[PDB]
C-alpha cells in the first residue's frame, strides 16, 4: 500500500468480458459505467494500481472516505470511473514464518493528496523536538507490518485489490475494447459497415490488384466501388443494389385490360418472361 504499481496500459483491445473468468474475484464494483457498455468506449490510457489490504479494509476503498488506509496510503477522489476489482489471496501470501514484509504507514502528519504514492522511510517526528534519527519517547517507526497467518478467519486475510483508473485528456484514445465481426455473404444485396464505411451493395469477388497499404477504394467521380476486407486478405467489389424503373405497356382501356410490366436494368433473375436490352 505504500509502494503500489502504476502500470500505464495503452494500445490494446481491452476485453473486459475476459476479466470475469480470469480469477475467482470477490469484488467487481465499477463506479463509472456499466461493464457491458465499457467494451464500446475508447480510452487513452488505463492506470492499473494494485495493493494488498485486509478484508475489513476493502470497504475503505471508495471514491471519498476516511480510514487508516483510505487517507494514509491511497485516496480516491469523487471522479473514479474505473473498478475496484479485488480478490482474496490467502493461498500463497500467508506462511507460518513471520509476515514482517508488508506495512501500512500507521503514523502520518495529515491526509495525503488523492492518487499519490509516498515512498518514504524517515522516522516520524512528533514535533517539539529535532529528531536526527532516534527511537524513544518522541519519534517512532511510522511503519507497522500486518499479522497475516494461515490459521485465521476471513476479514483479516490478504486481499489483493487492483483499481483501473480511466482518463481522457487532450490526446487520441488508444484502448477501445472488443469489436464484433460477423461473416460475409457473397452475391447478395445486403448492408455493410466495413471500418466506418457504411452502405449497401452486393459484395462480389473482384480481380483488382490493390496496394499493400490501401484499404478503401473509390471511382472516377466520388463513389466507393471496392474495399479491402479487414479479415484475411481478399479483394471484394461493392456494386450498388438492384434498382430500376417500372413501366406499364397498355393497349388502352377500350378493348381489354391485359398489361405488360417492364423492369429496367435487370436480368430477369433479380426482380411469359423475356429479357431485352
Amino acid at each position: 500500500v505504500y509502494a503500489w504499481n502504476r502500470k500505464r496500459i495503452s494500445n490494446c483491445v481491452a476485453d473486459y468480458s475476459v476479466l470475469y473468468n480470469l480469477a475467482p474475484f470477490f469484488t467487481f464494483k465499477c463506479y463509472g459505467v456499466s461493464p457491458t457498455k465499457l467494451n464500446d468506449l475508447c480510452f487513452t490510457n488505463v492506470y492499473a494500481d494494485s495493493f494488498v489490504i485486509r478484508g475489513d479494509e476493502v470497504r475503505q476503498i471508495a471514491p471519498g472516505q476516511t480510514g487508516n488506509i483510505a487517507d494514509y496510503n491511497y485516496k480516491l477522489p469523487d471522479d473514479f470511473t474505473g473498478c475496484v476489482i479485488a480478490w482474496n489471496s490467502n493461498k500463497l501470501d500467508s506462511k507460518v514464518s513471520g509476515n514482517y514484509n508488508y506495512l501500512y504507514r500507521l503514523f502520518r502528519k495529515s491526509n495525503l493528496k488523492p492518487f499519490e504514492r509516498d515512498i518514504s522511510t524517515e522516522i516520524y517526528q512528533a514535533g517539539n523536538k529535532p529528531c536526527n534519527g532516534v527511537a524513544g519517547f518522541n519519534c517512532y517507526f511510522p511503519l507497522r507490518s500486518y499479522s497475516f497467518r494461515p490459521t485465521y478467519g476471513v476479514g483479516h486475510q490478504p486481499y489483493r485489490v487492483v483499481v483501473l483508473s480511466f482518463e481522457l485528456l487532450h490526446a487520441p484514445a488508444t484502448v477501445c475494447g472488443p469489436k464484433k465481426s460477423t461473416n460475409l455473404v457473397k452475391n447478395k444485396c445486403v448492408n455493410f459497415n466495413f471500418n466506418g464505411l457504411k452502405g449497401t451493395g452486393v459484395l462480389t469477388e473482384s480481380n483488382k490488384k490493390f496496394l499493400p497499404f490501401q484499404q478503401f477504394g473509390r471511382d472516377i467521380a466520388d463513389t466507393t466501388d471496392a474495399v479491402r476486407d479487414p479479415q484475411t486478405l481478399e479483394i471484394l467489389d461493392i456494386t450498388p443494389c438492384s434498382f430500376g424503373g417500372v413501366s406499364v405497356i397498355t393497349p388502352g382501356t377500350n378493348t381489354s385490360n391485359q398489361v405488360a410490366v417492364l423492369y429496367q436494368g435487370v436480368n430477369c433473375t433479380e426482380v411469359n418472361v423475356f429479357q431485352t436490352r
Epitope: 473468468n21 470477490f26 464494483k29 461493464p35 478484508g55 475489513d56 478467519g153
Partner: single-chain antibody
Framework: VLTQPPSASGTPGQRVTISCSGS????????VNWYQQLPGTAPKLLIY???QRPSGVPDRFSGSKSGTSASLAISGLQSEDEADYYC??????????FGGGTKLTVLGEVQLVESGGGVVQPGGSLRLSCAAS????????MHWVRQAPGKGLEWVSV????????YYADSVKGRFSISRDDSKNSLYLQMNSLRTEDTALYYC????????????????????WGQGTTVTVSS
C-alpha cells in the same frame, strides 16, 4: 424490480430458458443469484455469481449474464426439476430485490433451524431466534428471507460476519433491530410496530461472505437454508 415469467411450460427431454430482466442499477452493477425451492421443503442455492455452482448443484444447470438480464438453462430437465426458480440481486440503493418465481411444471452438514414465531397480539411482537451447530458464525453473514404462505420470498435484513454495519429492507427500516451475541451460534431480531402484514416464515438464511453484501459485489451468495417457524399474527 425484477421481471420474471409467471409460469412457463415445457416437455421432458428437451431444455427450457428461464429469463430474469432487470435495470442497470441492480443487475448491471452486481451479479444475479438463482435459487431453487422445492414445494414443501426449504429453498436452496442453485447458481451464484452467474459463473460458479455449489458442490451439491450438479452440472444440469447453467446461467449467463448477457446484457442487463440473466438467462437460465437446464439441459435435459426431468420430473425432479419441477420446482420454483427465484432471481435475487443486490441493488446499489442498499436493498436486496428478489424475483417473482417460475412455476416450471411439466406433467410428463450444518443445521440452520430457527424458531421464535407463534401468534401474538397485534401492534406488538416478540423476538426472532436462530441457531446453528459449528459453522464459524464469526466468518459468515446471515440474512432474513421471509416467505408468506403461497406467496414469494423477500429479503428483510442482513447481518455481516464482522458485526458492524447492517441493512434492512425499505419497509422494515427503523422498527426492526437485528443483533448477535458473543455466545454460541445465534441471531436476534426484534420487531416493532406490527401492522399485521407479517404472515411469513422468516427464513434465517446462511451466507458465505464476511462483510455486508454491498462492498463484495461478486462473492455474496446464500448457503444452505434452514427449517423456519410459521409465525401467523392474523391480528
Amino acid at each position: 424490480v425484477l421481471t420474471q415469467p409467471p409460469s412457463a411450460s415445457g416437455t421432458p427431454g428437451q431444455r427450457v430458458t428461464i429469463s430474469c430482466s432487470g435495470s442497470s442499477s441492480n443487475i448491471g452493477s452486481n451479479t444475479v443469484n438463482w435459487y431453487q425451492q422445492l414445494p414443501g421443503t426449504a429453498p436452496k442455492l442453485l447458481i451464484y455469481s452467474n459463473n460458479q455452482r455449489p458442490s451439491g448443484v450438479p452440472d444440469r444447470f447453467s446461467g449467463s449474464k448477457s446484457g442487463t438480464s440473466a438467462s437460465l438453462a437446464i439441459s435435459g430437465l426431468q420430473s425432479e426439476d419441477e420446482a420454483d426458480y427465484y432471481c435475487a440481486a443486490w441493488d446499489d440503493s442498499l436493498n436486496w430485490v428478489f424475483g417473482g418465481g417460475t412455476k416450471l411444471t411439466v406433467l410428463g452438514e450444518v443445521q440452520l433451524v430457527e424458531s421464535g414465531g407463534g401468534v401474538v397480539q397485534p401492534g406488538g411482537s416478540l423476538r426472532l431466534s436462530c441457531a446453528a451447530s459449528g459453522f464459524r458464525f464469526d466468518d459468515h453473514a446471515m440474512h432474513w428471507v421471509r416467505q408468506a404462505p403461497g406467496k414469494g420470498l423477500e429479503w428483510v435484513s442482513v447481518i455481516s460476519g464482522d458485526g458492524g454495519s447492517t441493512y434492512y429492507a425499505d419497509s422494515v427500516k427503523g422498527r426492526f433491530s437485528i443483533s448477535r451475541d458473543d455466545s454460541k451460534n445465534s441471531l436476534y431480531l426484534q420487531m416493532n410496530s406490527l401492522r399485521t402484514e407479517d404472515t411469513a416464515l422468516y427464513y434465517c438464511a446462511k451466507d458465505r461472505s464476511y462483510g455486508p453484501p454491498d462492498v463484495f459485489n461478486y462473492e455474496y451468495g446464500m448457503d444452505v437454508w434452514g427449517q423456519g417457524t410459521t409465525v401467523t399474527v392474523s391480528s
